[model samples]
Target: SVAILQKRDHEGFGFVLRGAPIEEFTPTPAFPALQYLESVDVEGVAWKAGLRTGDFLIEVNGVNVVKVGHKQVVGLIRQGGNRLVMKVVSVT
Candidate 1:
C-alpha cells in the first residue's frame, strides 16, 4: 500500500492509503457526492491513543487522504502503534 502526505493551514496533517477498499458506511455517488466514513471504532489501543469515532482522519502524519483507500489507510494507522499523533478533523 502507498501513503499520501498533505498539509493544511488550519486542519493540520492528512494521510491517504492507496489501493484500499472503501467501507460500506461511506456514501456512494448515487446518494452523496462526497465520500466519508460513518464511524470508526476506537475500541482497543487506538482509543487509548486518542483516536475516536466522528473524528475525520485527515492524515497519518502528513498525507493527503484523498489519494488513499480504507484498508490501506487503516493499515498505515495500525503501523504507527502504541502512541500516535494522528491528524484528525474532530466532527464534534
Candidate 2:
C-alpha cells in the first residue's frame, strides 16, 4: 500500500504484529515465520493506509525484512521516526 500514512508525532502506526525470523507461528505449519500483521486499529492511521490484520509484512520502509525478527522489525519502524512505509502480502 502507498498511502504515505500520517500520524501524531508520538504515536505508532496503530497495529500489532507477530511471528519473525524464527520460522515459528506462521499462518501455516512448516513455514518460515514471516512477520504477520496480527491486528490493526480500525480507526487508526494504519487501517486508513490500507494495512489489514493477517497480512505478511515483506518490508519496512524500503528494506526487505522477510528474514528478520520482531525486534529488528521494531527497530526499523522506530528508526523511521514519524514517517512510515511498509509492504505486506496477504496469506489468505
Candidate 3:
C-alpha cells in the first residue's frame, strides 16, 4: 500500500477509474468493495504522483471509500479541491 498525493490542475487529476459496490462481489476481511485505477495520463497529476493502472483505491483523504460507489469516491476527491490524498494497494 502507498499514499498518493496529487494537486489537481487544469486538466484534472488525469485518472480513469472503474469500480462499484456490486451485489455479486465479495469483500475481503480487510477491505470492502474495490475501486480500481483503470488508467492514468502519462504526464498528469495522478501519474506524476505514482499512481498506476490496477491500483485499488482504499481511502480518500483519511476516509475509507471501500464500501462506496464511484460517485461517492469522486465526491470525496472533488471536495478536496486542488489537493488530494489517496491510499492505494496493488495485488502484485
Candidate 4:
C-alpha cells in the first residue's frame, strides 16, 4: 500500500492476467482489509497453488506478508524451494 508498485520476481506463482494489486486502496468489504485485486489470471504457479483474485497472501513461509518488506516477500518465495507454502485469505 504505497505510491510505488511492489515489484516482484517470478518462479511460477500468483499469476495475474492483466491484474494488479491496488496501491493504497481503501480497505472495504468488496475488497476487504486493503487486500484488493485490481479486477483480475490462470494456469500459473499461483493457480496451481489455489490462489484466487482478490485473495490476500497473508503468511508466506510462516511470515506475514504485511509485516515484511516487499523484497522479503519475494525472497521467501525464492527460498521457499520445492515445498513452498503460503496462507491466503479473503475478508469483508
**Clash number for every model?**
14, 1, 0, 1
Give the TM-score of each candidate: 0.41, 0.80, 0.79, 0.53
Instruction: For model 3, give the 10-residue run with minimal summed lDDT.
Output: 21-30
For model 3, residues 17-83, the per-residue Cα lDDT tens digits are 8886255566664444478888888877888888887788888888887767888898888888888
| Local distance difference test values of all predictions, in order | 0.43, 0.75, 0.77, 0.48
Q: Pick the candidate with the highest lDDT.
A: 3
Candidate 1, backbone clash total: 14
lDDT of 4 by residue, 53-89 (tens): 6666556677756544455666776686544566656
Rank list by TM-score: 2, 3, 4, 1
What's model 2's lDDT at 49?
85
Tens-digit lDDT track of model 1 for 51-86: 454455556645555445666566665664432445
lDDT of 2 by residue, 18-77 (tens): 873264433444232368788999988899888888777778888877778788898988
* C-alpha root-mean-square deviation, each candidate: 10.6, 3.3, 2.8, 8.5
Error of 4 at 88 (Å): 1.3
